Amino acid sequence: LNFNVIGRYDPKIKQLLFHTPHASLYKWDFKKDEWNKLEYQGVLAIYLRDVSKDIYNYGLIILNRINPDNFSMGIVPNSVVNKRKVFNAEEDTLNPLECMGVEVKDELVIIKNLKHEVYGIWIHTVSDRQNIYELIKYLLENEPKD
Amino acid sequence: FYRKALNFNVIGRYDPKIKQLLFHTPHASLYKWDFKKDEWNKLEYQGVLAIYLRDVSQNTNLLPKDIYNYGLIILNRINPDNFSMGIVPNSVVNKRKVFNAEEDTLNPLECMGVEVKDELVIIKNLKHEVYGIWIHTVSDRQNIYELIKYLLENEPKDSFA
16 A cells, blocks of 8 residues: 555554555646646555644645655645634634635646645546545545544 | 547647657656756656657758757646657767767767666766656557667668658
8 A cells, every 4th residue: 555655754644545656746826827837746645644733634645756755735624624714713813724625627636725725636547536536525525534 | 528639730830840750658757867966856847758750851942950850749738838859860979979070079969878767768868968757658668768779779760760
């Protein structure tokens, strides 16, 4: 799998949920209105994190195959974000957070984070593309962990 | 998923000389070797990789000497960026070193090279710069290596080959 390897970088990993051998990362530029290629390409994994206040119940990581670079992204379920907005309006007012989102446009799995930054991930295995999309959607639409 | 591609001579819009497409693979990612830090630096190019024959013939009335008989190009799929590299046969570089040393001493050129190292196809520039190309289609790595090797080791070809 890749549990130990990810464990080196994220000590809180509890269970690896999905991984694909080749995924390439891009970032949307709202000014130029285009996709900028980022320095990350390699193994892509999505995993459950032990978060017994860390709001990142899940994590997404891209580990470069030809160099040591790693890209890490936290995945926060909508329920956690909405709960913070309702029962913790103060902290949010200070550090405004919005619900993350995911969509498939063209060949890219597009993800919006808590700060409305948008990333694009290219995955070869077309079957993996749909699986990662459904998995992230599921992780965002349901109540945390298991 | 939705079909969007057209069968079109897109290379020709960036390099008018293309005369014959020799090889293409769907997904290839480009890296460059950094000698100072001894590591691969990821470059902003990934997409369709093609190797093609260029028309550098003098037997034409369209002329009022190009040494790049072949070309390699990577066309980004996610954005409009392209990476281009010319391919010159060793025999042409060697002849040049001897009978045109003046233009050489001004713009030094050495024999290019190619090898396959694990997952990468490694190409050495006419300037000794080293690039690494990760190709998704496994079998295409050996085939591109074989084609470039053949183009480098043989006499300049004007057509088919």
